[PDB]
Each structure stands twice: as structure tokens, then as C-alpha cells.
Design an enzyme around this catalytic site. Structure first.
Site, short mmCIF file in Angstrom:
data_model
loop_
_atom_site.label_atom_id
_atom_site.label_comp_id
_atom_site.label_asym_id
_atom_site.label_seq_id
_atom_site.Cartn_x
_atom_site.Cartn_y
_atom_site.Cartn_z
N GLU B 58 0.83 -1.20 0.00
CA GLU B 58 0.00 0.00 0.00
C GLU B 58 0.87 1.26 0.00
O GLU B 58 0.56 2.23 -0.69
CB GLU B 58 -0.95 -0.01 1.19
CG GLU B 58 -1.94 1.19 1.17
CD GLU B 58 -2.50 1.52 2.52
OE1 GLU B 58 -1.71 1.51 3.49
OE2 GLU B 58 -3.73 1.81 2.62
N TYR B 94 -4.99 9.44 -1.42
CA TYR B 94 -3.61 9.65 -1.00
C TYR B 94 -2.61 9.75 -2.15
O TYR B 94 -1.88 10.75 -2.26
CB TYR B 94 -3.18 8.51 -0.06
CG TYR B 94 -3.99 8.40 1.21
CD1 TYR B 94 -3.79 9.29 2.27
CD2 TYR B 94 -4.95 7.41 1.36
CE1 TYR B 94 -4.53 9.18 3.43
CE2 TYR B 94 -5.68 7.29 2.50
CZ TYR B 94 -5.46 8.17 3.55
OH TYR B 94 -6.23 8.02 4.69
N1 LIG Z 1 -12.72 0.39 9.24
C1 LIG Z 1 -11.66 0.82 8.51
N2 LIG Z 1 -10.40 0.52 8.91
C2 LIG Z 1 -9.33 0.94 8.19
N3 LIG Z 1 -8.08 0.63 8.61
C3 LIG Z 1 -9.55 1.67 7.04
C4 LIG Z 1 -10.83 1.97 6.65
N4 LIG Z 1 -11.88 1.55 7.39
C5 LIG Z 1 -11.00 2.79 5.40
C6 LIG Z 1 -10.00 2.34 4.33
C7 LIG Z 1 -8.54 2.21 4.79
C8 LIG Z 1 -8.01 0.85 4.32
N5 LIG Z 1 -6.99 0.43 5.27
C9 LIG Z 1 -7.17 -0.74 5.95
C10 LIG Z 1 -6.22 -1.19 6.87
C11 LIG Z 1 -6.43 -2.39 7.55
C12 LIG Z 1 -7.58 -3.13 7.31
C13 LIG Z 1 -7.82 -4.43 8.02
O1 LIG Z 1 -8.96 -4.76 8.28
N6 LIG Z 1 -6.78 -5.21 8.33
C14 LIG Z 1 -6.97 -6.48 9.01
C15 LIG Z 1 -6.74 -7.54 7.93
C16 LIG Z 1 -5.25 -7.76 7.66
C17 LIG Z 1 -5.10 -8.45 6.32
O2 LIG Z 1 -6.11 -8.55 5.59
O3 LIG Z 1 -3.97 -8.90 6.01
C18 LIG Z 1 -5.98 -6.69 10.12
O4 LIG Z 1 -5.09 -5.82 10.31
O5 LIG Z 1 -6.08 -7.73 10.83
C19 LIG Z 1 -8.53 -2.68 6.40
C20 LIG Z 1 -8.32 -1.49 5.72
N7 LIG Z 1 -8.51 2.18 6.24
C21 LIG Z 1 -7.33 2.82 6.80
C22 LIG Z 1 -7.62 4.06 7.61
C23 LIG Z 1 -8.89 4.36 8.10
N8 LIG Z 1 -9.10 4.24 9.54
C24 LIG Z 1 -10.47 4.08 10.08
C25 LIG Z 1 -10.84 5.15 11.10
C26 LIG Z 1 -12.36 5.19 11.00
O6 LIG Z 1 -12.95 4.23 11.89
C27 LIG Z 1 -12.65 4.84 9.54
C28 LIG Z 1 -12.92 6.10 8.71
O7 LIG Z 1 -14.24 6.58 8.93
P1 LIG Z 1 -14.58 8.17 8.97
O8 LIG Z 1 -14.21 8.83 7.66
O9 LIG Z 1 -13.79 8.78 10.11
O10 LIG Z 1 -16.08 8.32 9.20
O11 LIG Z 1 -11.47 4.17 9.06
C29 LIG Z 1 -7.94 4.24 10.36
O12 LIG Z 1 -8.02 4.13 11.60
N9 LIG Z 1 -6.71 4.38 9.84
C30 LIG Z 1 -6.53 4.52 8.52
O13 LIG Z 1 -5.38 4.65 8.04
#
Ligand SMILES: Nc1nc(N)c2c(n1)CC[C@H](CNc1ccc(C(=O)N[C@@H](CCC(=O)O)C(=O)O)cc1)N2Cc1cn([C@H]2C[C@H](O)[C@@H](COP(=O)(O)O)O2)c(=O)[nH]c1=O
Ligand SMILES: Nc1nc(N)c2c(n1)CCC(CNc1ccc(C(=O)N[C@@H](CCC(=O)O)C(=O)O)cc1)=N2
Ligand SMILES: Cc1cn([C@H]2C[C@H](O)[C@@H](COP(=O)(O)O)O2)c(=O)[nH]c1=O
Lengths: 264, 264
Positions: B58, B94
Site C-alpha cells: 500500500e 492519498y
Molecule cells: N474500518 C476501517 N479501517 C481501516 N483501517 C480503514 C478503513 N476503514 C478505510 C479504508 C482504509 C483501508 N486500510 C485498511 C487497513 C487495515 C484493514 C484491516 O482490516 N486489516 C486487518 C486484515 C489484515 C489483512 O487482511 O492482512 C488486520 O489488520 O487484521 C482494512 C483497511 N482504512 C485505513 C484508515 C482508516 N481508519 C479508520 C478510522 C475510522 O474508523 C474509519 C474512517 O471513517 P470516517 O471517515 O472517520 O467516518 O477508518 C484508520 O483508523 N486508519 C486509517 O489509516
């Protein structure tokens, strides 16, 4: 103020020597954060006298979207004189970015109106943000924004705000900046029927100029006094309709002013 | 990591219960800061196994200026699949802002190229900044940037970096976010013949989702282990020429991974 003098002592104890644009020479740390609960009192530095009238007028000017110093001069405020061009212009600094950030497709975004409507209708939003850091216009500005980016937050009926300050003259600039954003929180909270919460200050390059050190240690020898209180005497119909006379600071009993040379 | 587990415990103890955009519910605090000395070790959470494959690809994708998830799929990285459109597009998120921020007049600014030239030519600058918070293109993005703003700093031959994260999923997102920016620091330091300094993380709305609580309690019961060390095996010609094979993590002995549902 306790938090402010602790920061000064931290720069002195942990900072490293750094030059600036040719320039004067600084002592600098990177990364700091402190919190002022605005229900404890209005965070106007008491260990030296500060010029609140200039703070108020500068904030009203920002909120109008103005970037020419003519308004400031009509109210005997000179804090921007040294950066203005021969016509009094500063380029598209804070007030212009706050009220009319230019997009690539010919639009302009009023970020202050945007965050007022978010606070009133979607206060749980995690992106109630104002940025002055318009990368594509930095080269037109007389100075790149120091207080560059800020975010609001609502919980338990209280409005909080966090400022990211990428560069901070701790002795000269920071007292003004703290009081400015604290004032803005009170005005916003009034317009949205909220109580005041915390002002959270976060710093990037946080420094004391080398020619401010005797002044800094003089101030540090002094005991903070009780914080003053901010009284707003009217509820204007909009965040853009406040006047200087609507504000009164009560109980401000500062130690004497300390003069220090600006570093342009 | 100690500081990470202290933050998780703080949200549990002090967080306010909020309804959020997803209807899931959170516990949230506003304003936090942590500091990782990158010479103590690479800050990859050890109280659950984090999968570096996705983090590295990423970051390389960002540095390419790419905002289509095809490159990610070609490497079996699925973290952006939900928000992309039927063509794999995310809008100007980004990667586009890092590499080609559009000016109002139809030019572009390469913020990564700029920062490299500042570190090599003007390392004492107080404005070595990359912003993804392009107010005028937020409407076109699939998601508003969460890691919104970062700043570099040079003192005594060491490169430090501070990130402002406006919204932080403490359980799922933050471990990845910390590792990503720590990796970028190592890469820029290598390209600029600097040593690594601190990564400073600053949070706005910092929250735990209400369906992550079992997982949080499990993780808070685990003792952190010594941080691993990052090795870069090749020095590329530029910051834009790194490859996944260039990176090795040595001595990473995490506790087992913990699975939790992502709030969309
Ligand atoms: N739910 C959520 N989690 C995130 N990480 C995420 C997103 N959504 C939107 C896409 C982006 C993709 N990156 C990721 C990164 C990790 C995963 C994940 O699930 N990994 C698992 C699987 C590992 C594997 O598959 O190998 C593992 O680690 O075991 C998935 C996506 N990100 C990043 C991004 C956002 N948010 C949050 C804050 C708010 O809760 C919400 C925004 O919402 P709002 O605009 O504030 O309303 O995303 C962050 O806090 N730090 C950020 O850098
Ligand atoms: N090197 C450096 N230092 C800075 N502070 C700085 C800059 N460069 C660039 C542009 C600005 C504009 N904002 C301000 C700058 C300075 C002040 C300031 O010096 N206040 C004084 C007295 C004010 C009066 O009554 O006229 C007192 O409070 O005693 C207030 C606001 N700030
Ligand atoms: C406008 C402003 C400037 N400053 C100081 C920070 C820097 O020392 C200097 C900005 O110059 P710079 O672009 O090199 O950082 O002015 C403040 O501290 N607070 C403010 O509000």
C-alpha cells in the site's frame, strides 16, 4: 499558564540548535501536545501582559476572509505590517483559505460555514476540519501558514478543538495563537448552542529564538495567576457578525509585559 | 507496544459512547500523541500479528501516485476493495495528492519530490510537509483521508516525522498506520543519507468500535515483546524505485493474529 511554561522549559531542556532562513538561530523540539479545559478559564497568558485587542481584531479579520492589513490599521493593529506588500496585501493566507479555498474546477469552499453546519447537523462526524495548508497556493502567500490545520469534536454537549501548528515561535507567537483559537471555540459553541470543551494544541517544529532566551527565563521565574474569564454580551445571528465590543475579559491580572525582537 | 496498549486502555476507561456514520457505535477520545524512537526498534505491534505484506504494497502504491486498486490486487492486497468503484477507482485519494496535487490554475505539485529536495537542500526548513487534505477534491474521493497531514524534521543527522490522523480505528487501523509511516521514514532517510529519528503519532477522533471490545480485552491481556528491526537490502536510485523484496523484518515474534469485523 502552567502548560505553557512547562512547554518553554521542555524546549530549553530538550531542544537542539537549529538555524533558520539564513536568519537568527533557534532551539527546537519536534512534537508536543497540551490541553486547556476552557471551563477552567480563558487561556490568556498571565506571566506577561498580552495584547488581547489585537487578538480579537485579527480573528474577526480572518473570519471575514480578509488578507489586506487595511482593516487592521483602521483598528490600530500592526502585527502583520512586516509581511505585507506595498498595497498592504499578504496573498491568500488564513482568512482566504478559511472562507474561500479555491478548487481545481473553479469553485471556492467556505470551510467555516461548512464546519458550522456540521456541528449543528452532524456533530459526530470525524471530519469537522479547516485547513489553511493549500499546497497549490503556498507560493502566493507572504508566509506559509503556521497554525495550519484544525479539527473540532463534540461530546457531552461540549465543543473541543485541536490545532496542528507546524511551526511555532513559543515566546512571541504561541500566546496569541492559543487565545485566538480559544476565542473561536467560544464563538462557535455559542452559535451551535454547545458548552466549551478543551482546546488541544499540537506542535511540529516548536522553538525558541536565540535572541529570546533572557526574556524566556525572566517569564519562567514568575508564578502564573488565575486565568481570566471570557464574557460574550450578545448572540449574533451568524459566526460572521461578531463585533469587538461583544467581548469582555474579566479578571486579567498579568505580570508586566516583556518586550522581545521579532524574527521576520 | 506499550504506548499502543496504554492508548487502548485509555479509550476503554475514558472514551465517550458515540453513534457514528456506520451505525456501529464507538468509544472515543479526542487528542492523543505517542512517540516512537525508531532507533529502539521498528514499531510493529507485537501483541497481535500484523501482516506487513499489505502495509508495504500500500505504501509503494501511494508513492506511485496510483489510486486504482489493480496494483493491489496483482499483489493479493484487498484492504481497499470495499470503497473502490466497479473499475477499481477510489478518486483522488492519498496517491494522487502525494504525487500530483492540482493547483487552481492547472499545474501540479509533486509533494514527495518537493520533500526529498527540501531534505537534501534545506533540511532545517520548518515546512517539510505532505498533505492529503485537499479540501477542493474531498467530494471526489471514495473516503476522506484519515492520515491527513505529515511533517518531517531534521536535527543532528536524524530524520523525524509527525503524522496527524484525524480519525483512528485504534484496533484495526492504527497498527498499520504506525508501521506504514515508520517504513516511509526509513526509506526517506536512506535516500537522504540520514539516520532515523522519531515517529510522532497525533490523533484527532481516536476510537474503538463497539464490536471490537472482546478483541480489545484479549489484546490488553498480552504482554508486548521486543520490537523487531527493519532491514532494507538494496538502495534504489530513488524513493520511487523500491520493491517489496527490498524489505526484511528480523526478530518479529508476535502473539497470534486477532480477527475483527471492519466498520465500513
Ligand atoms: N474500518 C476501517 N479501517 C481501516 N483501517 C480503514 C478503513 N476503514 C478505510 C479504508 C482504509 C483501508 N486500510 C485498511 C487497513 C487495515 C484493514 C484491516 O482490516 N486489516 C486487518 C486484515 C489484515 C489483512 O487482511 O492482512 C488486520 O489488520 O487484521 C482494512 C483497511 N482504512 C485505513 C484508515 C482508516 N481508519 C479508520 C478510522 C475510522 O474508523 C474509519 C474512517 O471513517 P470516517 O471517515 O472517520 O467516518 O477508518 C484508520 O483508523 N486508519 C486509517 O489509516
Ligand atoms: N519569527 C516570527 N515570530 C512570530 N511570532 C510570527 C512570525 N515570525 C510570522 C508572522 C506572525 C503573525 N502573528 C503575530 C506575530 C507577533 C505577535 C506579537 O509580537 N505580539 C506582541 C505585541 C503585539 C502588539 O501590540 O502589536 C506580544 O504578545 O507581546 C502577534 C501575532 N507571527
Ligand atoms: C503567523 C504565525 C507565525 N509564527 C512563527 C513560526 C515561525 O517561527 C515563523 C514562520 O516562519 P517559517 O515559514 O520558516 O516557519 O513565524 C508563529 O509562531 N505563530 C503564528 O501564528
Amino acid at each position: 499558564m502552567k502548560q505553557y511554561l512547562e512547554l518553554m522549559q521542555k524546549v530549553l531542556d530538550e531542544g537542539t540548535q537549529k538555524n533558520d532562513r539564513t536568519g537568527t538561530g533557534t532551539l527546537s523540539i519536534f512534537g508536543h501536545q497540551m490541553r486547556f479545559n476552557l471551563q477552567d478559564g480563558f487561556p490568556l497568558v498571565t506571566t506577561k501582559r498580552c495584547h488581547l485587542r489585537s487578538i480579537i481584531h485579527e480573528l474577526l479579520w480572518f473570519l471575514q476572509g480578509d488578507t489586506n492589513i487595511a482593516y487592521l490599521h483602521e483598528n490600530n493593529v500592526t502585527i502583520w505590517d512586516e509581511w505585507a506588500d506595498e498595497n498592504g496585501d499578504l496573498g491568500p493566507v488564513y482568512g482566504k483559505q478559511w472562507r474561500a479555498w479555491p478548487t481545481p474546477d473553479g469553485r471556492h469552499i467556505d470551510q467555516i460555514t461548512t464546519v458550522l453546519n456540521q456541528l449543528k447537523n452532524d456533530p459526530d462526524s470525524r471530519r469537522i476540519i479547516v485547513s489553511a495548508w493549500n499546497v497549490g497556493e503556498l507560493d502566493k502567500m507572504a508566509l506559509a501558514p503556521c497554525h495550519a490545520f484544525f479539527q473540532f469534536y463534540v461530546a457531552d454537549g461540549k465543543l473541543s478543538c485541536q490545532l496542528y501548528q507546524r511551526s511555532c515561535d513559543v515566546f512571541l507567537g504561541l500566546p496569541f495563537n492559543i487565545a485566538s483559537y480559544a476565542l473561536l471555540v467560544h464563538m462557535m459553541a455559542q452559535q451551535c448552542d454547545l458548552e466549551v470543551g478543551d482546546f488541544v494544541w499540537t506542535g511540529g517544529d516548536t522553538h525558541l529564538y536565540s535572541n529570546h532566551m533572557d526574556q524566556t527565563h525572566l517569564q519562567l521565574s514568575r508564578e502564573p495567576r488565575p486565568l481570566p474569564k471570557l464574557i460574550i454580551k450578545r448572540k449574533p445571528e451568524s459566526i460572521f457578525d461578531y463585533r469587538f465590543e461583544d467581548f469582555e475579559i474579566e479578571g486579567y491580572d498579568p505580570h508586566p509585559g516583556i518586550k522581545a525582537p521579532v524574527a521576520i
